[PDB]
């Protein structure tokens, strides 16, 4: 039996563009994920977010599912272009209405709302002005955040500025695999910097407008291990500092980028980037870590490449390494000692099938989840201030450049009918929540 602290927060997480559909409904502006996925070749099978889980219409049934499961928290994001169709200026009341109904329903049902201000669907209108490459996005992002705070901060008390800013910067602007689909290393590192400035402006606005709430920021993380006791160990140190929370938490807590990031990337950062660091250290209330996989790494003349290992993998091909989530929780306490931590995403893609009995027998997902929750429990016993854990995802959804081909939900979605079928893993997680732990 592994029981968690009294009042520990069990949740599920989604993102607006992955589940909503109806991206241009009720006066919404286009986002960069709309234009990116409507460009041939960018997304597997030409899939887009036009329909997705149709959550834009089915939101009440989805929340009734969260309730029925006994889940105590719901992490969801707001589409910036639904709220401000040109990114700044005009506010769309029907966009506010859509989220106001979700927020009120959650509160009525006693589910704690965790709102992600930005989960990758930037207004297209702002991308035309350079998007995350433009220093002015710090102002645009502050104006957007202020609207949300003024409108929803009476009810939502837990906020997240950014989801996975490393991915937004590097996968969007260096690898070109995500919107807005660019390949320019100087743009990518300017986006890193501007994401930090915008995050800090939003926190500053939060302190004036929501005097009783808490605000944090969410990072993707991998557990990197070296391919030899040899350059190899440093390559691993590099990957942690670049790919994990330190790229952002070193600025936030210590006022400069991490050592090995500066070594690799100094030339790509704005010349006087240090001028902004005083403002970047704006105090945050919590750190959200996302976590999925482990990676064997070696030096390879970013002077790093991955080595495949004969470990169990998910449908993404991500090696399953549960001790990574213990490692990243311990490491964040050890390096920056944040006052609170949340695991804001943990989950797995498996090739789910509805059996003849009408059920989805995803023991593989149960096994994955159980092992990572066990490792999180361990971190708590050893003093990590972990306040909550969020499963990615409530629903199968639009998995970015993989489209609908990858299923992460604990609830199955039949896209031909939009029917939801709770999977074995969802039933299993519900029991974990009720018992406040494992057994
Ligand atoms: O925030 C996220 N991180 C990784 C998930 C699985 O790839 C993704 O679906 C989600 O948007």
């Amino acid at each position: 039996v592994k029981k968690f602290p009294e009042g520990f927060l069990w949740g599920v997480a989604t993102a607006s563009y992955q589940i909503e559909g109806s991206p241009l409904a009720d006066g919404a502006g286009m986002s960069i994920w709309h234009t990116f996925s409507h460009t041939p070749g960018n997304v597997k099978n030409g899939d887009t977010g036009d329909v997705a889980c149709d959550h834009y219409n089915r939101w009440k049934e989805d929340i009734e599912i969260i309730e029925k499961l006994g889940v105590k928290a719901y992490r969801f994001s707001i589409s910036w272009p639904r709220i401000l169709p040109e990114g700044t200026g005009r506010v769309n009341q029907k966009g506010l209405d859509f989220y106001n109904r979700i927020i009120d329903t959650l509160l009525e049902k006693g589910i704690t709302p965790f709102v992600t201000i930005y989960h990758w669907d930037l207004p297209f209108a702002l991308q035309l002005k350079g998007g995350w490459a433009n220093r002015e996005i710090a102002d645009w992002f502050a104006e957007y955040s202020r609207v949300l705070f003024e409108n929803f901060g009476d009810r939502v008390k837990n906020w997240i500025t950014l989801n996975e800013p490393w991915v937004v910067a590097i996968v969007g602007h260096l690898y070109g695999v995500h919107a807005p689909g660019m390949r320019d290393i100087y743009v990518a590192f300017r986006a890193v910097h501007n994401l930090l400035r915008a995050h800090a402006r939003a926190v500053k606005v939060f302190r004036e407008t929501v005097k009783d709430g808490k605000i944090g920021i969410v990072f993707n993380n991998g557990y990197f291990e070296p391919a030899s006791e040899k350059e190899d160990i440093r390559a691993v140190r590099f990957m942690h500092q670049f790919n994990n929370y330190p790229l952002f938490l070193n600025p936030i807590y210590r006022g400069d980028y991490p050592e090995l990031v500066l070594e690799f990337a100094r030339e790509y950062l704005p010349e006087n980037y240090k001028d902004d660091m005083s403002e970047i250290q704006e105090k945050i209330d919590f750190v959200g870590l996302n976590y999925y996989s482990g990676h064997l790494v070696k030096f390879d003349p970013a002077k790093v490449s991955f080595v495949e290992r004969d470990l169990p993998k998910t449908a993404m091909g991500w090696e399953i390494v549960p001790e990574g989530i213990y490692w990243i929780l311990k490491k964040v306490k050890e390096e920056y000692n944040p006052p609170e931590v949340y695991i804001t995403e943990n989950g797995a893609a498996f090739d789910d099938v509805v059996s003849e009995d009408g059920r989805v027998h995803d023991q593989n997902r149960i096994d994955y989840l159980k092992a990572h929750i066990g490792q999180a429990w361990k971190a708590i016993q050893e003093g990590v201030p972990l306040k909550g854990y969020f499963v990615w995802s409530l629903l199968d959804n639009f998995e970015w450049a993989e489209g609908y081909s990858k299923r992460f939900g604990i609830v199955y979605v039949d896209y031909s009918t939009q029917k939801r079928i709770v999977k074995d893993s969802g039933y299993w997680y519900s029991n974990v929540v009720k018992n406040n732990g494992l057994e």
Side-chain angles (χ1 to χ4, degrees), residues 18 119-120 163-164 290 292 318 345 392 399-400 408:
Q18 304 186 256
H119 202 130
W120 305 1
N163 184 79
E164 295 185 358
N290 298 347
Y292 292 89
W318 296 347
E345 293 186 24
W392 181 273
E399 174 53 39
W400 306 116
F408 277 89

